[PDB]
């Protein structure tokens, strides 16, 4: 079967370089082309280019020349990328694509390599409890974990055991530094007539904190 | 021995198609017989010549034959800012057939093919197209492994290696009983000649119509080379297959090579993976040694012997003199892991510019002894110049010298009889394998049927 | 370079439904297209290449057509996994480019958020800072607006908004607003609100609070 | 006493003839009834046999035409003479042998015909511009050997098809050259240029109006071009008395029959003329490449002598075509042409150092032998073909005709010709196997048992019929 492995998520710091590769699982990388595209949320998807690891020839989207370079070495069964002086704009997800039959068409895709540029530094996340004001018959609580990096987090009630009524969001970037939220919602019979509490990991640091939601 | 001689059925196209340059025996999936006829001038839609393929049901009167329609429309797609272009003027589609199951397999070796990049190209040039039909079904496709995409800069830069713009696929075709395609191409690789083999399945299940360059992942293409004895050597001239190295798990590959080591000629077996086994070289130069090659055990011992011609061999004669008559070489394959030697036995023709050797057609066990028989074509032999096909019979020893029974053109001068064989196939159902012959010149084909011995 | 404007952005669409997608070129590409399929969270998957013919080992509901600058993906009888993004791309020449991407989302009945508005905690307070949190929760459609009001005046800087995916369950979404300021800005002013805009009630639905006042 | 021709019992004279040479016959009347009739012409005259009914032939060789071998083939209308005698009467009785002689002579100051066949494929661009002072400079150097020396010259490239011929860009078909920075002529497979002339300012001046063209593959069909300069006489303008040599240049290898097939080209060459007053190969893309011996066949059928005048790349290529083409030379041409001169004089001394006879329409009842005199007067038995020779040298052999038996027809003739020469000798033999006194026999004789049989020779026959 065709299989593009490629390689690991990347955290780099901007100007640096970096080399992502997509490795062929049962059949010769020299076979076809092989083409990069870069994925973004906001601007979608963009080609990179192409090679033919057959002879080495390339060809590039003129936005990206300088800073894509697109390589291939037959022995190991790879294909590179090279991308350098990178910048916050360059944070993206990039995919090794090749065709099925069709000599220029785009069918089989890697999993994709996921790259994050920043200045920032391994930061610990601040946990806040987030109690409700001085009623109804259901009732909601909170919990906000600001200025952790990197990613991600592991986020759970009462130690995975309060599980179904919940709502965790995904991380937002706020100046270099990620910010996260979850909700958790039960009835008034429940809170504060049972403890609960936001346990909360951050791996990249090493810390799992956990605090107890108090009310007003 | 028991052809008869006498009573033949006789096929017929279109004036100046050369109707019968390539035939084949096609069971369709109930078993009944039927002959594909190759005619490589046949006229297309724009009243040019293109070539074309017939489908002949067996009748003992003959006559004609309905056509095996094929696209015949030159093909232009604008893809990846580039422009592929087919030409299928003079492609000579039906310049050699083959079949194998219930699929017929005609090939174009002249089929022209370029690319178009702005201000360059990749060169107008016969990289050779072979198209495939289930004839009950209506199923068609394509296969066409030297077209390229690479401009004609590339090529100079790198001293033209791996060229496969003149190929010329489908010059020469055969069928594993596994169910692969192999294609000689006596023009890739800058004329020193290549093979392409891919499975006939996976031809259909990755053919798309108008894609005109896609991947075959499970083709296998032979290799350049440096060499200087392998070049202009045209290899893949003639193919065939065969068991030669004991494995029965694998089929091995005999390519001639008529013009290997400056016209010297070679033929060579191979494994599956392009691997040299052996060589034999040709006596003479320019004889063409390699011109045609067939493999069947002629002395029943269930090792395949391997036959080449060499339709230029020039026999010597009395007073220093050399005369072109032709030759056929027979190689015995010898007992488990060993070279195949010398040969057992040398035919030689006897009339000048006979070419002696020029087809060789397995026939199967013709008079049913327990060895297998061939037939040798002389397409300009025979005392009045008109074209002979000669039977030597099987024997413990190899074959016999002499031939058991000789078939006269029934044609007028100049139809090639001969130069297109087929046998060991039963058409009539009487028990005994028949022999089609065919006359390219005539535009005919001649169908001689196999009698109890008499 | 050849721009690809693919249409509709998103679609509401229920199970068994028969949709199709559009794709059109700013100029012919003769069938050079292909379209792709990536399942939320997941890589991408070939569809279609040339137009109308299918990848290897995709079902046959999928479909394209098409010609010249307008082609189409069209899906019989929707699957429960058929819900994912969609992308055409064309490579009649280079570079190649892509559509901005469709997305098939479930459908259903409309429903109104649950607010609920938190303040800060008393650990942010004792470092420096101050966030409130809006939390939005269980609401179809997608389409909210979410407006925040100090002392009854909108605030723009600082806001930070995150929402969910649509839910395996309830088939809804979700909104979280986090307005931060620093401790000394969050004391000059004593009332927190912020309002919802949803096609569910023409009267924005609002939850509030008072400092110092509980 | 008793010989063989006695013991054996003869019935006629026929049969007492075809005993032995030495046997006679005798016809005379009075003869005594005990006495042999057949035997040696001594013992029949010793038994008072009438000499003038004595049937005794004797084989002989007398000369008919024995003009004297010719110092200088200059001047004549090519009344010039290689072969003495030139004619000869034989006479032979049943299993019989006489021996009769010949001379040949390779005369000085014989004409010559130079057909200069070039490629002209982009591989000899350096080379075109080294012979264009050839034609005069050649002049020059064959003076020293004949006076009649006429040259011309005719050019070749391959058949201009796909895919020897670039057939893309459009321009490419005007100029194929055109993806480099230079101009080329379109190709063309073989294009007569000039008419064997004794002027030789006119092949400096094709020359140097000649250029270059270019094609894919590194084989040439230069033997098309062989094949029409060899069998379209008179277009080239070969002389019927003079030795043809015909220069072959290229610095590649050449295309070979069957090689057409990958053009779509599957016609068998046909050995005729196909030059028209286009001086173009007009069947070059119709037509596939001449085989060895078909080449063969027609520069023996012309009296061509081939000469490879071929770069040392190839040299060994050519040589071994050359074995497979009995009486071509090969020499060994420079990069750049500049030493073709030197080669064709020491081809022509080469060419005519041989002289090797050849036998043609000899009956199938006759069987000959050869002893050589090379040299100074160095017989060597068995062997009819001398070679290390000069011009104006001179050999002769001396030959033996054995005949078997008797045939049926009394006179036949045959040729003695030695390759390549113009003149022969002829044998016109003689069978001489009946009696004279046979034109005079009695049929149904009252001598011979009452009419039942025939008289002839003194003796009685049995009739037709019996
Ligand atoms: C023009 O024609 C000549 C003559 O036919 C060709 O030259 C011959 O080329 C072949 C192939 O290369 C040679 O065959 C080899 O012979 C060797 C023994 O030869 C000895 O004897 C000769 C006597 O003349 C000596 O000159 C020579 O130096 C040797 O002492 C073998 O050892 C070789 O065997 C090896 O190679 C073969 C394949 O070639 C393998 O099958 C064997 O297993 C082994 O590995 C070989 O048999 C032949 O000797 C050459 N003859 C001469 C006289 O040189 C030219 O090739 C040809 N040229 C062109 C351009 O066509
Ligand atoms: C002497 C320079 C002449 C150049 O001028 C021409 O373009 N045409 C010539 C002839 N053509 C040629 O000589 C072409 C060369 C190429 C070449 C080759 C061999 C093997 C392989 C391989 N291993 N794949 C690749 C290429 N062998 O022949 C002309 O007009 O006479
Ligand atoms: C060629 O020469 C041989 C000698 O080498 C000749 O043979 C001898 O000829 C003489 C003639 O007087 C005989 O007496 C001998 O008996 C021969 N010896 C033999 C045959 O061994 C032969 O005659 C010569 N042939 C020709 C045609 O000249
Ligand atoms: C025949 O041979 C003899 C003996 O060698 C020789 O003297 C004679 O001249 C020859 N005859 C002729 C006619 O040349
Ligand atoms: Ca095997
Ligand atoms: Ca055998
Ligand atoms: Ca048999
Ligand atoms: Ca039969
Ligand atoms: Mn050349
Ligand atoms: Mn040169
Ligand atoms: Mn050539």
């Known amino acids: 079967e065709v299989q593009l492995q490629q390689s690991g998520a990347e955290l780099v710091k901007p100007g640096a370089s970096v080399k992502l590769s997509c490795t062929a699982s049962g059949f010769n990388i020299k076979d076809?082309?092989?083409?990069?595209?870069?994925?973004?949320?906001?601007?979608?998807?963009?080609?990179?280019?192409?090679?033919?690891?057959?002879?080495?020839?390339?060809?590039?989207?003129?936005?990206?020349?300088?800073?894509?370079?697109?390589?291939?070495?037959?022995?190991?069964?790879?294909?590179?990328?090279?991308?350098?002086?990178?910048?916050?704009?360059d944070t993206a997800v990039y995919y090794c694509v090749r065709p099925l039959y069709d000599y220029y068409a785009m069918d089989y895709w890697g999993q994709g390599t996921s790259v994050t540029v920043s200045s920032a530094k391994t930061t610990a996340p601040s946990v806040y409890p987030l109690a409700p004001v001085c009623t109804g018959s259901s009732v909601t609580?909170?919990?906000?974990?600001?200025?952790?990096?990197?990613?991600?987090?592991?986020?759970?009630?009462?130690?995975?055991?309060?599980?179904?009524?919940?709502?965790?969001?995904?991380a937002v970037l706020q100046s270099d530094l990620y910010t996260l939220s979850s909700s958790v919602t039960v009835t008034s019979s429940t809170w504060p007539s049972q403890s609960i509490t936001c346990n909360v990991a951050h791996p990249a640091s090493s810390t799992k904190v956990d605090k107890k939601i108090e009310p007003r | 021995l028991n052809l008869d001689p006498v009573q033949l059925t006789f096929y017929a196209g279109p004036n100046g198609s050369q109707f019968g340059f390539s035939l084949d025996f096609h069971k369709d999936s109930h078993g009944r017989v039927a002959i594909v006829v190759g005619a490589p001038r046949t006229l297309g839609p724009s009243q040019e010549e293109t070539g074309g393929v017939f489908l002949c049901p067996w009748r003992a009167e003959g006559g004609q034959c309905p056509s095996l329609l094929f696209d015949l429309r030159d093909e232009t797609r604008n893809v990846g800012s580039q422009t592929l272009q087919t030409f299928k003027a003079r492609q000579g589609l039906g310049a050699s057939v083959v079949s194998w199951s219930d699929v017929i397999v005609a090939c174009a070796p002249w089929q022209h093919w370029n690319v178009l990049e702005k201000t360059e190209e990749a060169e107008k040039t016969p990289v050779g197209s072979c198209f495939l039909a289930q004839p009950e079904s209506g199923r068609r496709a394509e296969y066409s492994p030297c077209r390229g995409n690479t401009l004609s800069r590339i090529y100079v830069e790198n001293d033209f290696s791996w060229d496969k713009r003149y190929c010329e696929a489908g010059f020469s075709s055969v069928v594993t009983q596994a169910g692969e395609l192999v294609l000689g191409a006596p023009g890739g690789y800058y004329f020193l000649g290549l093979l392409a083999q891919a499975p006939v399945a996976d031809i259909f299940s990755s053919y798309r119509p108008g894609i005109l360059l896609w991947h075959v992942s499970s083709q296998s293409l032979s290799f350049d080379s440096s060499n200087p004895e392998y070049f202009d050597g045209y290899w893949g001239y003639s193919v065939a297959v065969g068991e030669f190295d004991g494995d029965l798990n694998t089929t091995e590959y005999v390519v001639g090579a008529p013009t290997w080591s400056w016209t010297l000629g070679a033929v060579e077996i191979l494994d599956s993976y392009y691997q040299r086994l052996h060589r034999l070289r040709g006596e003479q130069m320019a004889?063409?040694?390699?011109?045609?090659?067939?493999?069947?055990?002629?002395?029943?011992?269930?090792?395949?012997?391997?036959?080449?011609?060499?339709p230029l061999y020039m026999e010597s004669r009395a007073d220093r003199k050399?005369?072109?008559?032709?030759?056929?070489?027979?190689?015995?394959?010898?007992?488990?892991?060993?070279?195949?030697?010398?040969?057992?036995?040398?035919?030689?023709?006897?009339?000048?510019?006979?070419?002696?050797?020029?087809?060789?057609?397995?026939?199967?066990?013709?008079?049913?002894?327990?060895?297998?028989?061939?037939?040798?074509?002389?397409?300009?032999?025979?005392?009045?110049?008109?074209?002979?096909?000669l039977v030597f019979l099987g024997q413990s020893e190899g074959l016999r010298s002499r031939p058991s029974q000789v078939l006269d053109s029934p044609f007028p001068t100049g139809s090639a009889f001969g130069f297109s064989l087929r046998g060991a196939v039963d058409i009539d159902d009487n028990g005994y394998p028949d022999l089609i012959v065919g006359a390219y010149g005539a535009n005919q084909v001649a169908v001689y049927r196999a009698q109890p011995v008499v | 370079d050849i721009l690809m404007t693919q249409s509709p952005s998103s679609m509401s669409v229920s199970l068994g439904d028969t949709v199709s997608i559009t794709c059109h070129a700013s100029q012919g590409i003769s069938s050079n297209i292909g379209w792709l399929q990536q399942k939320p969270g997941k890589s991408f998957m070939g569809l279609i290449y040339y137009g109308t013919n299918l990848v290897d080992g995709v079902p046959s509901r999928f479909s394209g057509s098409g010609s010249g600058a307008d082609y189409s993906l069209t899906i019989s009888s929707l699957d429960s996994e058929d819900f994912a993004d969609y992308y055409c791309v064309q490579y009649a020449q280079l570079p190649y480019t892509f559509g901005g991407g469709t997305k098939l989302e479930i459908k259903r009945a409309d429903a109104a958020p649950t607010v609920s508005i938190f303040p800060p905690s008393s650990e942010q307070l004792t470092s420096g800072g101050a966030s409130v949190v809006c939390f939005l929760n269980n609401f179809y459609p997608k389409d909210i607006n979410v407006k925040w009001k100090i002392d009854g005046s909108e605030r723009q800087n600082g806001v930070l908004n995150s929402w969910t995916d649509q839910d395996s369950k309830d088939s809804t979404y979700s909104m979280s607003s986090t307005l931060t300021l620093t401790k000394d800005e969050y004391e000059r002013h004593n009332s927190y609100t912020c309002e919802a805009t949803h096609k569910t009630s023409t009267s924005p639905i609002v939850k509030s609070f008072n400092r110092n006042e509980c | 006493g008793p010989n063989i021709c006695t013991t054996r019992g003869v019935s006629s004279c026929q049969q007492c003839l075809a005993v032995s040479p030495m046997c006679a016959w005798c016809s005379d009347e009075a003869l005594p009834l005990g006495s042999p009739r057949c035997d040696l012409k001594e013992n029949l005259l010793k038994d008072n046999c009438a000499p003038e009914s004595i049937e005794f032939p004797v084989s002989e060789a007398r000369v008919l035409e024995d003009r004297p071998l010719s110092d200088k083939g200059s001047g004549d209308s090519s009344q010039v003479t290689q072969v003495s005698?030139?004619?000869?009467?034989?006479?032979?009785?049943?299993?019989?042998?006489?021996?009769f002689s010949?001379?040949?002579?390779?005369?000085?100051?014989?004409?010559?015909?130079?057909?200069?066949?070039?490629?002209?494929?982009?591989?000899?661009?350096?080379?075109?511009?080294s012979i264009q002072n050839l034609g005069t400079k050649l002049a020059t150097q064959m003076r020293k050997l004949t006076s009649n020396l006429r040259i011309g010259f005719g050019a070749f490239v391959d058949k201009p098809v796909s895919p020897y011929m670039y057939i893309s860009p459009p321009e490419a078909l005007e100029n194929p050259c055109?993806?480099?920075?230079?101009?080329?002529?379109?190709?063309?497979?073989?294009?007569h240029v000039l008419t064997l002339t004794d002027q030789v300012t006119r092949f400096n001046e094709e020359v140097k109006k000649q250029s270059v063209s270019r094609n894919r593959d590194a084989p040439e069909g230069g033997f098309d071009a062989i094949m029409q300069a060899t069998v379209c006489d008179e277009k080239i303008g070969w002389r019927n008395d003079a030795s043809h040599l015909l220069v072959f240049t290229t610095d590649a290898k050449t295309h070979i029959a069957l090689d057409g097939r990958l053009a779509g080209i599957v016609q068998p060459n046909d050995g005729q003329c196909h030059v028209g007053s286009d001086n173009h190969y007009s069947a070059s893309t119709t037509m596939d490449y001449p085989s060895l011996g078909l080449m063969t066949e027609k520069l023996?059928?012309?009296?061509?002598?081939?000469?490879?005048?071929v770069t040392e790349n190839v040299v060994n290529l050519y040589q071994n075509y050359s074995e497979l083409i009995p009486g071509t030379t090969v020499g060994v041409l420079s990069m750049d042409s500049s030493n073709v001169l030197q080669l064709i004089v020491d081809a022509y001394g080469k060419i005519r150092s041989k002289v090797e006879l050849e036998v043609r329409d000899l009956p199938e009842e006759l069987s000959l032998s050869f002893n050589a005199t090379c040299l100074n007067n160095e017989v060597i038995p068995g062997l009819k073909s001398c070679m290390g020779l000069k011009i104006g040298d001179t050999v002769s052999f001396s030959i033996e005709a054995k005949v078997r038996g008797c045939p049926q027809e009394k006179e036949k003739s045959f040729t003695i010709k030695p390759v390549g020469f113009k003149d022969s000798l002829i044998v016109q033999v003689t069978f001489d196997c009946d009696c004279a006194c046979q034109a005079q026999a009695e049929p149904n004789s009252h001598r011979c048992n009452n009419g039942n049989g025939t008289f002839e020779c003194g003796v009685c026959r049995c009739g037709p019929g019996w």
């Not at chain 1, 979608?44 to 590039?60: F, H, M, Q, S, V």
């Not at chain 2, 063409?288 to 011609?309: E, I, K, P, Q, W």
Request: proline share 6%; glycine share 10%.
């Open chain 2, 287 to 310: 004889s063409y040694f390699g011109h045609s090659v067939a493999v069947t055990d002629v002395n029943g011992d269930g090792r395949h012997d391997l036959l080449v011609g060499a």
């Open chain 1, 141 to 170: 609580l909170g919990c906000l974990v600001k200025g952790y990096f990197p990613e991600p987090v592991t986020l759970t009630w009462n130690s995975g055991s309060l599980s179904s009524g919940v709502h965790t969001f995904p």
């Open chain 4, 300 to 309: 023996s059928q012309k009296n061509i002598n081939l000469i490879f005048a």
């Open chain 2, 322 to 389: 050399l005369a072109e008559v032709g030759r056929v070489y027979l190689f015995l394959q010898p007992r488990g892991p060993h070279a195949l030697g010398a040969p057992s036995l040398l035919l030689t023709g006897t009339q000048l510019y006979g070419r002696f050797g020029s087809a060789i057609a397995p026939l199967g066990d013709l008079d049913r002894d327990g060895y297998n028989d061939i037939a040798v074509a002389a397409p300009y032999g025979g005392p009045s110049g008109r074209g002979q096909v």
């Open chain 4, 85 to 99: 005698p030139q004619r000869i009467a034989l006479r032979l009785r049943p299993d019989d042998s006489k021996n």
């Open chain 1, 32 to 89: 076809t082309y092989v083409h990069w595209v870069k994925q973004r949320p906001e601007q979608g998807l963009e080609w990179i280019g192409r090679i033919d690891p057959a002879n080495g020839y390339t060809k590039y989207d003129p936005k990206f020349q300088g800073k894509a370079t697109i390589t291939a070495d037959t022995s190991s069964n790879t294909a590179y990328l090279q991308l350098s002086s990178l910048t916050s704009e």
């Open chain 4, 178 to 191: 055109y993806d480099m920075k230079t101009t080329c002529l379109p190709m063309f497979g073989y294009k």
């Open chain 4, 102 to 129: 010949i001379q040949v002579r390779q005369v000085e100051d014989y004409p010559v015909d130079i057909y200069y066949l070039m490629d002209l494929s982009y591989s000899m661009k350096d080379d075109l511009w």
